């Protein structure tokens, strides 16, 4: 027997003749994109053999094999419906329905406390799925860059725990939701910020990453770390957003001075520089598609699903997912934990970094915020998503009433 | 072929006649109990068979068919290792190790505020397991009866949501933690108790169950419900605890009057009778074994794993697990959710009702409480349990490092 | 080929038919006693056939088989020189030499402390050995009865740990050595007596054994336990010593009231009654011979060597030996632990209960005590024993210089 | 009859002539390392035989014998499973389990004390095993140098007892534990430090070693002596530790002048110089691996296991193990002797020199210390080790219950 032949005869019409477009169409049907990095050798070989002629354009058993052999394990998985969502084409059809149902929710207000945020049309709206196996789907304005803003707080927290461990990091920042009556003050009883997802805790977390090197290096390191997380999809930087976040961060300066007086930073911290580094991190740019891969790294235990690279240690990913469960949607965190039951993080640009652990990462993005600061359409989509599929964290994987389970072929 | 025979040949192992004990030893090694209520036809037929046969004891292929025919579906899954934890033998060896390790942890003080709690030895330590498939294991003092106390709050909240639905119930009780917060206060900002797991929330929830009947029926209605969740294993009642709980419940009356003044109950509530009913529900008795079956019903989407009976709606089990996650362990809830990441509930008698969704339910019991009111040995065992197994809510099911996964066999 | 004949050929070799006396001389040369309770059925069958037959007195292979059939495993090990000391004859020859050496050491003062057993002769000196296999040897006054006194302290501690557990028992008593130290104090810094071998620790351990019954029952319970350790050899009682210990224990009454005031006993303790139970346990009587079997039981992981019966749990025997190591010999414990490195316990009647783990148990008895309260001859013998043999806890089993190893063969 | 072909017919599947790598894989599975000094002749010969890389590589029986003849006795013992842990592959699998189980106790605090230990990461964690026969295993950061600090106290005590005898050495230092917050006192009743494992006694012991020569020779001579102990594996020296230790030993200078005034040193001692020698000895560097060999020399009666050389007299080793038993772990000595039962010595760098007499030596190393000054992870590992294996000094070798005995076959 032979692994590449057995797959060949499957894609074949039971015949000696596989058009190349047919193989590409059959591959996309699994949800993988031809640009998938773990498929490069195969796609390289297809480019080679499609240069060989122009009156081709078709693969023998051994020429087909000549392309796929380097990537055969991944390709057989895709075609033998081994992926976490076997019938992904039906799943994207539901994601499209949900997208159009949230698209009709044109409420909310675009953040206008800085020009870069207020310029954004209230009509932009995108949703991008990337499963733990790299299957990709997008509806809407998914390639438009926007700033992460607070959506960066879990990513940097995970960096910090990845490099330093849980015990050190939580010498400086708590582990618990603050919660709603006291969503205003800065420090819990132990004089630490309540958790990494509030501004004070985010600011403290910023002060732990790559201590010793300067802010130009530190930002470089976070970018490289973020690139690993997105499988080298789009990550960028809005200097405009940086400058206006910087020129109007009085509450952030208040927090930094308060944390300094309270001795909240590690020894040898330059607080005013950390605020600058914090403003930079908030201005990092992503798209729906590329942020969805970062979310899929978190859904996948710290392995980037479209490169296979270990990016975050599993301690880091669990801690971060834990804190996004209870602290990730501002004052809506408890409501969201209760009704959506998914680790998520929103940001003022309108992003919601959403994680279905073991299944998929998602990024939703619609600039109009509700009065708690969360994207209206993003919040609506998250609710529908879990009304549809047994993705709620305490849904039962066996008895789940009439919710749909996309992990099953039935 | 035929379901009874191919399993018969599975156990026949070369001989034709299967010895009875040999079938029973293979059956128990799956972790099922011969007294499992879903095995009754099979076991009555065995017992009857060993009456009507010489001294046997051996089963022919047709006699084996006669016994196991009624229960053949479950017996196959048990024997084809298709249960949620396939190598249950090895798993219980680990439970035993965890049990022994927490047994060395003294510290804590038995709740002594009432003499019925003060009587229990500090050396009582019991732990019981029941998987979503009915597989069972127990170590230590697991047949000693003790009162649920606060472990009843998630159970009665589940009853309320099952009968009334999420929306009606949470008109009266919020859905968000305290955190470590302050929980001396009674009402959130909507003049609702914060969540069903704090005493004020519990008291209100109690005021919703079976409105209209008297306390004697209300009580029977809840016990009938508990009986089902426990597959009809021990659910008792400690009138000595009840009388002593009501003759020293100043804070609870303080709460009942405050709630009445703030109009937190449904119209037509007799508040002082609701407090009496509340005190009854706290004095309901369980063993580790029987309460572990209650936990498994919540692990199993509302179906009792040892009877197959549906006890709670999926919406009921989901909300309860969400709230045990964030508000179940008193002021340790945030730490517990962070480090253990399992829906759990503690009680002043020393129990920790614990739920590993889709896997198993547990009850750990050791009377000595720590400063926050949680069983010292149970909190310890819970930490070790998740140190060992990738059971943490935000562990990854694929990439989990050196953690052991008992749903795998590799 | 049968074990009975194979063994039969061993002692036959030459003539056929083994004379009974030839069998008996070869049996006792292994160091077993013909009265060994594990050989009773063999010995009854001999005695019977030497009635059944005016013949012989000679055993052919089939008659020898009839006799030794039921005790063949032990008789095999005994004759195949598989006992822990194979050349037992040579070893006892060394015991005798050590015995005669300690005998010329005629110093010390018999405890005048007590009108009774200030009555024993300084010239009484006895030494009894029982190995972990039942091999016995005695030299000197080894059938003279004397009181355990403090030699009972490890035995009742072992009983308490056995019934109650290490963890319950050591809520009431520490585990750390005396030392020259706080020789006079009663309590360590946790307000517990320092360990079970000091009088206040012993008095507390006594208050733990068989709580809830009267002193007559407790005493029978401890004596039945002492009977099993001693393979049912002499365990008696000296009311003469007891009554006299009881009307002259002002120090112990001092300890009992201090312990009561500092809340060291279990709830519901009758301290003055405990003091009388304690006085009773000190007046329990043994011989060297019978007490050597108790030591051997501790040397054998808790199995009585001459009955094969489990008397104490492994946890109980290990704790006891750990505490006899460091607290066993009054203010000589540190010195003794250093120079002898054997778990031992001395009593004021002149006994020293010596345990060579995995080898043998011993009792040495000479009434004259040195200024520290340890038998002058016994301490001398214990020093000579360890200079001769590589029995010191921290001798090496493979590299031991000019020391003799009696587990090895000649 | 032969002996080297016997081994050849064992290593060979009774066929051709044994690939060299197959012999190497067979050897490494006994636990021996190919770098074993006692195997140098055999490995020189394989290195010589395989120098015809022109063509190899099989051992034409006589060619096999050509290599193994010199070291046959040690090679057959290894292959005939005569080593003290026969199934050494299984044992190291348990060591890894124990290692990773301890790896999760991230509690404790690295000695800030001096910058050179404040520079070591709380993530480091290594554990090395060397049995009395040379079988080696390591897990974790076992090649990272760290200072012995007080782990050197038993090694220099043994040297002094080796060179000067027990009577002389204990004219100056005692032989008994002090005994729990007893530790402040520098001197016992006879105005000698209490034992060689406290700083006062260690300082006095240091002043006995190689009197007459200057401190540069003395340090050299202790290095040569430590080189033999480690089988010439890594022994080094940290000058940075040394200078930091000397610029901050006010306590040691306090002890120094106390001993000088109390006339505790040998005549003609230069106390201030001895302090400097002492500081050097504490700054001597080892690795986990090389330290485990030092520990295995003490487990092996003073013979280095991987060289066969007699390094310490048996008097020195037994005295050293006796004093490590009772005095080795600071205020935790008594608790440690009781619950672990192994002679051990800890150091502020985070090391624990662990000895299982007649079985193996070990070094565990993790910088973070508990409040008693003992490595958190190391203490956790020691507890687990004795909870698994019957290595407790007073575990019975025959009746040992739940525990694995690695000295035994199947
Ligand atoms: O002592 C000398 C001379 C001397 C010798 C050496 C050192 C100093 C003085 N002459 C006396 N000897 N005994 C005397 O009366 C003793 C009898 C028992 N008793 C106590 N036992 N345990 C105690 N400690 C605690 O209950 C908690 C605790 C323990 C340790 C530290 C703090 C609290 S008190 C008082 S008078
Ligand atoms: O107590 C506290 C309170 C405290 C402080 C911090 C934390 C907790 C508690 N602090 C002190 N600790 N040590 C102090 O002085 C040191 C130096 C002198 N001294 C001695 N060492 N050896 C001696 N010899 C005998 O003792 C013989 C001898 C023994 C028996 C009988 C006669 C003579 S003297 C100890 S001061």
UniProtKB/Swiss-Prot annotation, chains A, B, C, D:
UniProt keyword Acetylation present: yes
Taking the record's annotation, the residue ranges forming a coiled coil are none
Task: Cite a single GO BP annotation.
Answer: glutamate biosynthetic process
Phenotypic consequence of residue 186 to S: No effect on catalytic activity. Loss of inhibition by BPTES
What happens after mutating residue 258 to L? Answer: No effect on catalytic activity. Loss of inhibition by BPTES
According to the UniProt entry, what is the EC number of this protein? 3.5.1.2
Q: Where is this region: Highly mobile activation loop?
A: 179-186
Q: Name the domain of life.
A: Eukaryota
Q: What is the effect of changing residue 150 to A?
A: Loss of enzyme activity
Q: What is the effect of changing residue 185 to A?
A: Decreased enzyme activity
| Activity regulation note | Isoform 1 and isoform 3 are activated by phosphate. Inhibited by BPTES. BPTES binds between subunits and favors dissociation of the tetramer into dimers. Inhibited by 6-diazo-5-oxo-L-norleucine (DON). Enzyme activity is stimulated by phosphorylation.
Task: State how changing residue 182 to Y affects the protein, per the record.
Answer: No effect on catalytic activity. Loss of inhibition by BPTES
Enzyme class at the top of the EC tree: hydrolase
Subunit arrangement? Answer: Homotetramer, dimer of dimers. The tetramers can assemble into rod-like oligomers (in vitro), but the physiological significance of this is not clear. Interacts with RAF1 and MAP2K2. Interacts with ATCAY; the interaction is direct and may control GLS localization, negatively regulating its activity.
Illness: Developmental and epileptic encephalopathy 71: A form of epileptic encephalopathy, a heterogeneous group of severe early-onset epilepsies characterized by refractory seizures, neurodevelopmental impairment, and poor prognosis. Development is normal prior to seizure onset, after which cognitive and motor delays become apparent. DEE71 is an autosomal recessive form with onset at birth. Death occurs in first weeks of life.
Q: What does this protein do?
A: Catalyzes the first reaction in the primary pathway for the renal catabolism of glutamine. Plays a role in maintaining acid-base homeostasis. Regulates the levels of the neurotransmitter glutamate, the main excitatory neurotransmitter in the brain.
Q: What is this protein called?
A: Glutaminase kidney isoform, mitochondrial
């Amino acid at each position: 027997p032979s692994l590449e032949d057995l797959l060949f005869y499957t894609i074949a019409e039971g015949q000696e003749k596989i058009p190349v477009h047919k193989f590409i169409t059959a591959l996309k049907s699994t949800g993988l994109r031809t640009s998938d990095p773990r498929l490069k050798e195969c796609m390289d070989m297809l480019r080679l053999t499609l240069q060989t002629t122009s009156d081709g354009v078709m693969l023998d058993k051994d020429l087909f094999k000549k392309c796929v052999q380097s990537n055969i394990v991944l390709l057989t998985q895709a075609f033998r419906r081994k992926f976490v969502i076997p019938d992904f084409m039906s799943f994207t059809s539901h994601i499209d329905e949900l997208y159009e149902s949230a698209k009709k929710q044109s409420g909310g207000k675009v953040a206008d406390y800085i020009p870069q945020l207020a310029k954004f049309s209230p009509d932009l709206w995108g949703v991008s799925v990337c499963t733990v196996d790299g299957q990709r789907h997008s509806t809407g304005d998914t390639k438009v860059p926007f700033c992460l803003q607070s959506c960066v707080k879990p990513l940097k927290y995970a960096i910090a725990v990845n490099d330093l461990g849980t015990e050190y990091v939580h010498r400086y920042v708590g582990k618990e939701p603050s919660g709603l009556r006291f969503n205003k003050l800065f420090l819990n009883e132990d004089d630490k910020p309540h958790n990494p997802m509030v501004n004070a805790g985010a600011i403290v977390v910023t002060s732990l990453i790559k201590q010793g090197v300067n802010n130009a290096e530190k930002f470089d390191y976070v970018m490289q770390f973020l690139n690993k997380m997105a499988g080298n999809e789009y990550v960028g930087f809005s200097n405009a957003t940086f400058q206006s976040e910087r020129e109007s961060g009085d509450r952030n300066f208040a927090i930094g001075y308060y944390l300094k007086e309270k001795k909240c930073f590690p020894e040898g911290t330059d607080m005013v520089g950390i605020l600058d580094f914090y403003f930079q991190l908030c201005s990092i740019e992503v798209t729906c598609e590329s942020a969805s891969v970062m979310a899929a790294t978190l859904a996948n235990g710290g392995f980037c699903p479209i490169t296979g690279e270990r990016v975050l240690s599993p301690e880091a990913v669990r801690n971060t997912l834990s804190l996004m469960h209870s602290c990730g949607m501002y004052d809506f965190s408890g409501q969201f934990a209760f009704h959506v039951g998914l680790p998520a993080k929103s940001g003022v640009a309108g992003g919601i970094l959403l994680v279905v652990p073991n299944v998929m990462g998602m990024m939703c993005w619609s600039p109009p915020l509700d009065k708690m600061g969360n994207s209206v359409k993003g919040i609506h989509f998250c609710h529908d998503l879990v009304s549809l599929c047994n993705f709620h964290n305490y849904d039962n994987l066996r008895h789940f009433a009439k919710k749909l389970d996309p992990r099953r072929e039935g």
